[PDB]
UniProtKB/Swiss-Prot annotation, chain A:
Protein name: Multidrug efflux pump subunit AcrB
Top-level taxonomy: Bacteria, Pseudomonadati, Pseudomonadota, Gammaproteobacteria, Enterobacterales
Induction (UniProt): Positively regulated by MarA, Rob and SoxS transcriptional regulators (at protein level).
Assembly notes: Homotrimer, with large domains that extend into the periplasm, interacts with AcrA and TolC. AcrA may be required to stably link this protein and TolC. Interacts with AcrZ. Part of the AcrA-AcrB-AcrZ-TolC efflux pump.
Included stretch of the parent chain: 251 to 300 of 1049
Biological function: AcrA-AcrB-AcrZ-TolC is a drug efflux protein complex with broad substrate specificity that uses the proton motive force to export substrates. (Microbial infection) Involved in contact-dependent growth inhibition (CDI), acts downstream of BamA, the receptor for CDI. Its role in CDI is independent of the AcrA-AcrB-TolC efflux pump complex.
Organism of derivation: Escherichia coli (strain K12)
Subcellular location: Cell inner membrane
Amino acid sequence: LKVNQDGSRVLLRDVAKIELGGENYDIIAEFNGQPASGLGIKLATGANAL
Amino acid sequence: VDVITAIKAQNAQVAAGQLGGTPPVKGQQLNASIIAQTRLTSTEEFGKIL
């Protein structure tokens, strides 16, 4: 991000936490209290459900 | 060019964020959307563009 006049170098980790998180944090799914994810599949128009 | 730049800078919609958005702090109780610069509404506001 920057090179100080003292010669030291500022890295992104010096000013931030870098991790793998999520694009969004608004939806939290719990199955019987345990953390969970899942797929809310929807049937296409005029399609067999079975 | 100056007029167009001023009108584009001073008549715009700007995304701001959220108070107490996700991922939040553990004890957060309040959540509110942050409103920021929005489009002008009247000839009077346009005339006051600097």
